[PDB]
Structure 1
Amino acid sequence: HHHMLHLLEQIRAYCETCWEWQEAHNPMPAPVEHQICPAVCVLMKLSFDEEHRHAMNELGGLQAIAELLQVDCEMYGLTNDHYSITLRRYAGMALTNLTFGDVANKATLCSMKGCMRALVAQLKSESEDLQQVIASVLRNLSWRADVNSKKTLREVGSVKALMECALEVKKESTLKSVLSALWNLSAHCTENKADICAVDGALAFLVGTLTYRSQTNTLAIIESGGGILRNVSSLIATNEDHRQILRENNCLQTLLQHLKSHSLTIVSNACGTLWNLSARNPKDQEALWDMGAVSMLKNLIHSKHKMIAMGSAAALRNLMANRPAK
């Protein structure tokens, strides 16, 4: 409380010093010289506890921390020096925590356009740890986003930036965070689905995630990649160029194999993708028949899981109509 007020006053003071410099541009303020990183570090730690977050919010923690992140990004840009990367990481982690389950904070952070642009820009940092933090913030912000937040997230180009980021990531942990954010964003509107589809090599990458080989033995990447694909497949359904990319990477074959999974999320995602792709395309309709999709989806209609019963029934009904010749 007392220490929390002290740390936030330190951060606000530094921000004010930086805004004074920005307008005057008197030497450039360096974060090291003001011990700023230890300050956000402690605030990052405390923000994991619910009651500390409550105090932090009453002291305007979201404003101070978001504003610190923003100003450092504007001042130094995409720098590689350890101190600035670490500073931005801690700040972004605290913003992740402060936006978790907080309706007001999600909407407020989205309305801060300058900070939103700064966040999105950090996805092209060659620090994957930083990339992972930025994706985590965007994941929370896109979860149950109101009308205004949905618009803002779209306008700052967060969808394209995350998809482009995903193609370049070398670490599984960065990719988890990136795909989770995209999973949320891909459900927002048609424009967001189009932006994913329009990125060069993105659809092939997404089909690639369906057979991903996790060495942490998780299903996270298959689930989220398949989740994104399920969301965008409604757009793919009416686009022959997009269907062809899926055909070249054996997508339908994999989706059928996904109906055998023990993960209910994977089955659900597969059912939804097959639901979209079984509509209005004789070529893919025939292929699904040839692969035995009818009997496979027949097993899942009486499922106790709501989306599996619905998705599998919707797909089957699209196959029962549009019967290919025996």
Structure 2
Amino acid sequence: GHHHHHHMLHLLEQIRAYCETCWEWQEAHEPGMDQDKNPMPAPVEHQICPAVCVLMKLSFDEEHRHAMNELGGLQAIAELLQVDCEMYGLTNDHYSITLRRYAGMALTNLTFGDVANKATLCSMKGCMRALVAQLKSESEDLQQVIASVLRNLSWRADVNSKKTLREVGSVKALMECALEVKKESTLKSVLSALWNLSAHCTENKADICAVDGALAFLVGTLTYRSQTNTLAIIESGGGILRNVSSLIATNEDHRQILRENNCLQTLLQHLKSHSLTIVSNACGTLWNLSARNPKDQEALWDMGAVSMLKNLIHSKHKMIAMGSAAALRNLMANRPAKYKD
């Protein structure tokens, strides 16, 4: 019979009505000292977590996602996230933390494989500012959900969305976040988001390198010791390093940072990895760093890089074949004088 997503409608209607409640408060918020009363709408008193929790679970299925997209679900969930962040700031309140996490999980699912929803969410600038700001939250699980959203927003982004992600300071915020995270799984999401952002433009690459301690940290991630039986951190960190190494190659200071954290020698060890992503990333980084610098050319020569790169030039993987060969040409074309006697 009349069997539609009316429960979903009811759950969206709950969230829109709570959103409405909140915007009445902040419309009425007399700048600064609103009054002695001090009561914002509390999301617990509206039972919002259960509502957003249900929409989050429904968002794993594609058919419910289609229904959600017809009924403006992404706009409502994003609005919910924004307003709570704006009202209560960077709280450790578990009810507020849980709310933002579940909202962010739904936005992650809703932006997955959906270029329109990526653009819509990116066009909601206030929500995007809230997301970025939540990377400074003391909840590392919130950070992790926030980075998951930005990871999907940074993948197959249209040019305006790419422009917005840059303008809201997502790149700097993710890199500064990364330096302070303890939980491995949080770091994965954070570095997954950065790896994506790092391929967009020179400006994003430059901003990653400009963050204090960021290149030293990224070199450290190359020898990360996982507690989750995965190479995600080495792959993502090295992938970020590969994309930004085009700029590091022009910069003697940034090269010197890499040298003192044993980067080139680690990149050579990475050529023997059982992850082909790690080998590929290293071949890309070595390609860049072996151009236009005698110091690192001579250093790679001394570490046996030429013999190591030879072994991969006939690889069946294309970027390993291309990456090792181009780095090999550079070293062959700049043979140090002491290897001609």
- Once the two structures are overlaid, the 10-residue window that deviates more, 275-284 or 27-36, is 27-36
SS at match of 1:216: coil
Aligned-pair distance for 1:21? Answer: 1.3
Aligned-pair distance for 1:313? Answer: 1.1
- Once the two structures are overlaid, the 10-residue window that deviates more, 314-323 or 278-287, is 314-323
Structure 2 CA distance for aligned equivalents of residues 40 and 147 of structure 1: 31
Aligned-pair distance for 1:264? Answer: 0.5
SS at match of 1:78: coil
Structure 2 CA distance for aligned equivalents of residues 28 and 112 of structure 1: 23
Structure 1 CA distance for aligned equivalents of residues 39 and 183 of structure 2: 38
Report the equivalent of 1:276: 288
Structure 2 CA distance for aligned equivalents of residues 323 and 150 of structure 1: 41
* 1:106-130 CA distance string (max 9 Å, x none): 0111111000000000000000000
- Once the two structures are overlaid, the 10-residue window that deviates more, 293-302 or 120-129, is 293-302
Structure 2 CA distance for aligned equivalents of residues 254 and 239 of structure 1: 20
CA RMSD of aligned residues (A): 0.9
Aligned-pair distance for 1:74? Answer: 0.8
Aligned-pair distance for 1:73? Answer: 0.7
What is the aligned length? 325
TM-score (norm 1): 0.98
SS at match of 2:40: coil
TM-score (norm 2): 0.94
* 1:37-88 CA distance string (max 9 Å, x none): 1100000011001111011111111100000000111111111111000000
Aligned-pair distance for 1:318? Answer: 1.0
Instruction: Pick one of 295, 300, 305 that aligns with 1:288.
Output: 300
Structure 2 CA distance for aligned equivalents of residues 119 and 14 of structure 1: 19
* 1:134-181 CA distance string (max 9 Å, x none): 000000000011110111000100000000100110100000010000
Aligned-pair distance for 1:321? Answer: 1.1
Structure 1 CA distance for aligned equivalents of residues 133 and 103 of structure 2: 15
Structure 2 CA distance for aligned equivalents of residues 170 and 261 of structure 1: 25
Structure 2 CA distance for aligned equivalents of residues 75 and 213 of structure 1: 39
* 1:84-107 CA distance string (max 9 Å, x none): 000000000000000000010001
SS at match of 2:187: helix
* 1:162-204 CA distance string (max 9 Å, x none): 0010011010000001000000001111111111101111100
Matches within 5 A, 1:220-299: 220-299=232-311
Structure 2 CA distance for aligned equivalents of residues 216 and 27 of structure 1: 43
Structure 1 CA distance for aligned equivalents of residues 108 and 322 of structure 2: 34
Q: Which runs of 5+ in 2 are unaligned?
A: 30-37
* 1:297-318 CA distance string (max 9 Å, x none): 1111111111111111111111
Aligned-pair distance for 1:9? Answer: 0.5
The answer to whether 1:201 aligns with 2:213 is yes
Structure 2 CA distance for aligned equivalents of residues 38 and 203 of structure 1: 42
SS at match of 1:269: helix
Instruction: Pick one of 317, 321, 326 that aligns with 2:333.
Output: 321
- Once the two structures are overlaid, the 10-residue window that deviates more, 82-91 or 302-311, is 302-311
SS at match of 1:210: helix
Structure 1 CA distance for aligned equivalents of residues 326 and 112 of structure 2: 34
* Rg comparison, structure with higher value: 2
Structure 2 CA distance for aligned equivalents of residues 272 and 47 of structure 1: 37
Matches within 5 A, 1:86-101: 86-101=98-113
Structure 2 CA distance for aligned equivalents of residues 160 and 28 of structure 1: 32
- Once the two structures are overlaid, the 10-residue window that deviates more, 109-118 or 23-32, is 23-32
Aligned-pair distance for 1:27? Answer: 4.4
Structure 1 CA distance for aligned equivalents of residues 154 and 42 of structure 2: 33
- Once the two structures are overlaid, the 10-residue window that deviates more, 295-304 or 96-105, is 295-304
Report the equivalent of 2:313: 301
Structure 1 CA distance for aligned equivalents of residues 229 and 106 of structure 2: 28
The answer to whether 1:111 aligns with 2:123 is yes
Instruction: Pick one of 81, 84, 89 that aligns with 2:96.
Output: 84
Identity of aligned residues (%): 100
Structure 2 CA distance for aligned equivalents of residues 306 and 46 of structure 1: 40
- Once the two structures are overlaid, the 10-residue window that deviates more, 186-195 or 25-34, is 25-34
Structure 2 CA distance for aligned equivalents of residues 315 and 144 of structure 1: 29
After TM superposition, which residue ranges in structure 1, 4 or more long, deviate above 2 angstroms? none
Structure 1 CA distance for aligned equivalents of residues 40 and 220 of structure 2: 46
